[PDB]
Amino acid sequence: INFDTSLPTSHTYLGADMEEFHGRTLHDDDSIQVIPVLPQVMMILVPGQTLPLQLFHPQEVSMVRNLIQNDRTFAVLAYSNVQEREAEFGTTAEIYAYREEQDFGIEIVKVKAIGRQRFKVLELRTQSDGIQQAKVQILPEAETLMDRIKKQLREWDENDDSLPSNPIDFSYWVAANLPIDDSLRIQLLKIDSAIQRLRCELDIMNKCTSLCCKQCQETEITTKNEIFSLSREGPMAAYVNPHGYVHEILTVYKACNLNLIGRPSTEHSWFPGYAWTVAQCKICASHIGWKFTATKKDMSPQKFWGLTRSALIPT
Amino acid sequence: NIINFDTSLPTSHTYLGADMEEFHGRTLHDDDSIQVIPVLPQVMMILVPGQTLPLQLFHPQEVSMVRNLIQNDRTFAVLAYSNVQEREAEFGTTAEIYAYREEQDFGIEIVKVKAIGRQRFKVLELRTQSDGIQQAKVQILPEAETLMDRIKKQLREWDENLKDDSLPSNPIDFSYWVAANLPIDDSLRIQLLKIDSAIQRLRCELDIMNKCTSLCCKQCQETEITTKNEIFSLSREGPMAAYVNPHGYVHEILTVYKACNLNLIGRPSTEHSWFPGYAWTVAQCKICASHIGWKFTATKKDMSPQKFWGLTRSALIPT
Ligand SMILES: CNC(=O)COc1ccc([C@H]2CCC(=O)NC2=O)cc1
Ligand SMILES: CNC(=O)COc1ccc([C@H]2CCC(=O)NC2=O)cc1
Ligand SMILES: [Zn+2]
Ligand SMILES: [Zn+2]
């Protein structure tokens, strides 16, 4: 495995002149705050998880510009029902990198943020100018469980320095990287105790199955056991396509029942040194993810896949 | 200068998919009536009766709303924002869905729609529900052939093809064709939409045409890019039309035969092309490198014109 696993976390495709912020805002337990939510964000976010964004609607640009002038923190709601904008919990996201640019006269803002604190939603109110403000309450934050989880993680993929040592940070690493659906992510986000969070995760890893194509609900694509981490963030990560759409990707060493489309391409690659090719379901041709292929034959691995969470469903 | 290409192809939006469902039904609201019509949250374009609006919708709340629209009157409200940055709008126009197709990419439900502007309105109430959707309480508004010939005369002096069949015979439709196709900024579009009477609209448009100057790149303002005399129409919609990029972003572009102070980026491409038979290359300002639009180049030697430019309204300001 010869590849710098610190390059993906940099999101260099998004831009390399990104202004950086080192100030850190952290709210007290049980404190009630009013935090804006970005209307296009759909992701469930946990503390320690990074969220890259590319925004071009003038209202999102203005609100990020104002956040950058202040505490740089927005609210990422854990929607139980994104079609209905229903959410009871969420995680704050603190912008740590920022970039302005223009394209065709349209002001664009590129942002890189990281989850900081869980919160319970108290009120979701929309302003007269359309922007949404959420009144939230900041929630407060067993090495046997940790060792047991780390044990079954090594059984799935041979991956210590990669995993956090603190039980709180480790519980959130596991919550954000397990190949689980949204309902289980929200279940884990509701849990207040790291001990309880780790114990629920152990139960989830054991009931885990395999990943089928959602459009088929039949054809198996990959499994926990080919999960393969190419990034310090872990085997699961959010990346932005060239037009602002955020994909959550699970990297696996081998996949089944998948065809390729088009020509391997290096543009806007989420894994520097690698080229991507659209992978679709060999049964329904539903796009599922991308196969990445080395650009220099001196790199290991030579082939790996990055499959979107949204295209997969567990058995 | 002579055209050897089917100007009815661009209006079909075949790049959006050629197997679009269509609807024969037509809904029209009574004059001076209050209607409650939903507003798509990411639409930003100023719409006029008779104008086409293509869309590609990703958000599950958008596709739910449009799915429900397809099962009802297929009509949403397009606001003419004074300030998009703050959702400030006093007038608008209804858009009726006339074509539709559902897709699914990476497990994400996708809706593509082609809609046409029908009736303009004044907004009485904008109110966002609990789920986030915006509903607009609106009042449908009620709807000198010398001005018409005077308008048409200076249109021909800009482009020869803008002559007869390319232009509507009715003064109401004609004032809306002109409002949608003049190379004017958003403040003038809103001014024309506010006008209640067609004769008043036509006379305002004649005044605007006489004061029309040139189009400069927005970022640096100094460099001219094109001018009204270089306009020429390659679609039955007219010289000005909205098209969707492959990711759902709607671009309003003006087609012109010649542009200055523009460099090109890379090699021509035929993917997702808005003008079948032509390839596109990103065009950018010579001075400040800002992307301005696209140069279109024919893929066959027997096509005419062999080259033209589609320049976005958003990158251009008047002189
Ligand atoms: C016509 N265009 C489209 O439909 C969308 O185009 C895309 C979408 C996703 C990417 C990913 C691929 C993986 C990677 O490494 N980086 C990316 O941005 C690239 C282009
Ligand atoms: C990083 N950029 C991408 O991945 C692709 O972005 C685009 C944007 C606009 C187009 C237009 C060009 C003109 C035309 O005729 N059709 C289009 O769709 C095409 C691709
Ligand atoms: Zn399938
Ligand atoms: Zn310029």
Residue numbers in the entry:
A (entry chain A): 47 to 187, 250 to 267, 270 to 425
B (entry chain C): 45 to 187, 250 to 425
Q: Could you pull the original sentences from the published paper?
A:
The ubiquitin E3 ligase cereblon (CRBN) is the target of therapeutic drugs thalidomide and lenalidomide and is recruited by most targeted protein degraders (PROTACs and molecular glues) in clinical development. CRBN consists of an unstructured N-terminal region and three folded domains: the Lon protease-like domain (Lon), the helical bundle (HB) which facilitates binding to the adaptor protein DDB1, and the thalidomide binding domain (TBD). We present the design of CRBNmidi, a construct that readily expresses from E. coli with high yields as soluble, stable protein without DDB1. Importantly, the stabilizing mutations introduced based on PROSS analysis proved to have beneficial effects, with the best-expressing construct (construct 8, hereafter referred to as CRBNmidi) incorporating 12 mutations.
Furthermore, to assess the suitability of CRBNmidi to study alternative, non-thalidomide scaffolds, we solved the crystal structure of CRBNmidi in complex with compound 1, a phenyl-glutarimide based binder, to a resolution of 1.95 Å. While compound 1 used for crystallization was a racemic mixture, only the (R) enantiomer fit the electron density well. The two protomers in the asymmetric unit capture two different conformations of the N-methylacetamide group in compound 1 indicating flexibility (2nd panel from top). Comparisons of the crystal structures of CRBNmidi bound to compound 1 and lenalidomide reveal that the glutarimide in compound 1 adopts a near identical binding mode to the equivalent moiety in lenalidomide (3rd panel from top). Together, these high-resolution co-crystal structures validate CRBNmidi as an enabling construct for X-ray crystallographic structure-based binder design.
